[PDB]
Amino acid sequence: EPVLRKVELPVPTHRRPVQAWVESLRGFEQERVGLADLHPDVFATAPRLDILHQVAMWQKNFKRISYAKTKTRAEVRGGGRKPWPQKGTGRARHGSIRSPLWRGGGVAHGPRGPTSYYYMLPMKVRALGLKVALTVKLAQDDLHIMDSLELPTGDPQYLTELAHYRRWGDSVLLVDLTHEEMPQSIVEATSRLKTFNLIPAVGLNVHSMLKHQTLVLTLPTVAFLEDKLLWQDSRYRPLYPFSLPYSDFP
């Protein structure tokens, strides 16, 4: 009984849904249990590696808060009195022993206070980055769709052997719809592994997709991503934050 998935969201009349093999983790050789149609505007978009770079750098930096601070000549202890008179000493003119020139003095232009590098790319840009990441994985044959993440056993050895047999990458990012419903078998299998990382659908991000060689998705996660990312296309300009009630937005 093939697991055949069709695209629920409307597809552009000039584009045909891309296709992928729906697999299953229940067995080593279960490499083809169905056929899934993925939306072309999500899984066959332009390969904009520039946007990939933009989103990856945003993810790396916007959370960054450097805690490096140096004491300026005003904050270094002491250094109030003039070391010696202006004239007659035959020495260089100075006004305090804590100026940037002196040993143990202040830092003229150093890191000042905890600095934030926070900046937000447009949500459309970030959604497009997610789409481009998915398209890159699919085009480079690193995307593997699954019917479900249910494993026959919780042994990490089984998962590693399955990945090696299927010729997956050294690192696999497995994705499930929601955190709560993630199968206990896969939870146990991935809790002990380091290069196999299990995340909910809401946790998908460009940086992790790039860090992990292969991306494993389930059919409900595929539908979730399609809906969420396609909404950004054809959404209005916001009247107010989308957290607030809207006529048709969940």
Partner 1 sequence: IGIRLTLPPPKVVDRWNEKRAMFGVYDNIGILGNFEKHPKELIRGPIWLRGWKGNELQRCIRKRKMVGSRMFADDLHNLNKRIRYLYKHFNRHGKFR
Partner 2 sequence: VCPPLRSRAYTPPEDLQSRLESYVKEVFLPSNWQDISLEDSRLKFNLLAHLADDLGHVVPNSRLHQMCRVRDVLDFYNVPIQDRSKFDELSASNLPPNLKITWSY
Partner 3 sequence: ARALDLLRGLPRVSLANLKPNPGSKKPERRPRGRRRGRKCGRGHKGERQRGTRPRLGFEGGQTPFYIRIPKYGFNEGHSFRRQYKPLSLNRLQYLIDLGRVDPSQPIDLTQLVNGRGVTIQPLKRDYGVQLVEEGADTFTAKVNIEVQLASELAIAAIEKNGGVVTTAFYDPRSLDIVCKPVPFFLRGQPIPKRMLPPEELVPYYTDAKNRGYLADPAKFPEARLELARKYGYILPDITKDELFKMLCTRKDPRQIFFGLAPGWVVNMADKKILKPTDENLLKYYTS
Given the rule CB under 8 A, which residues bind partner 1?
Answer: 59-60, 62-63, 65, 72, 74-75, 112-120, 123, 126-127, 130, 171, 194-195, 197, 199, 201-208, 211, 224-225, 228-229, 232, 241-243, 249-250
Classify the phi-psi angles of 104: left when phi > 0, otherwise alpha if psi is within -120 to 50, otherwise beta. left
The answer to whether residue 244 forms part of the interface with partner 3 (CB under 8 A) is yes
Does 100 bind Mg ion (CB under 5 A)? Our answer is no
Least distance CB 102 / Mg ion (angstroms): 10
Residues 101, 106: Cα–Cα separation, whole Å: 8
Q: Closest distance between partner 3 and the C-beta of residue 130, in Å?
A: 14
234: left (phi over 0), alpha (psi -120 to 50) or beta: left
C-beta of 39 vs 73, nearer to Mg ion: 73
26 lies in the site for partner 2, by CB under 8 A: no
Residue closest to 142 by CA, chosen among 208, 188, 203, 191: 208
Closest CA to 42 of 138, 107, 166, 173: 138
Identify which of residues 43 and 58 has a Cβ nearer to partner 2 in the complex: 43
Asked if 165 interacts with partner 2 (CB under 8 A), we say yes
CA distance 97 to 43: 64
Range 23-52, binding partner 3 (CB under 8 A) = 44, 46-47, 49-50, 52
Q: Return d(Cα 159, Cα 149) in angstroms, integer.
A: 11
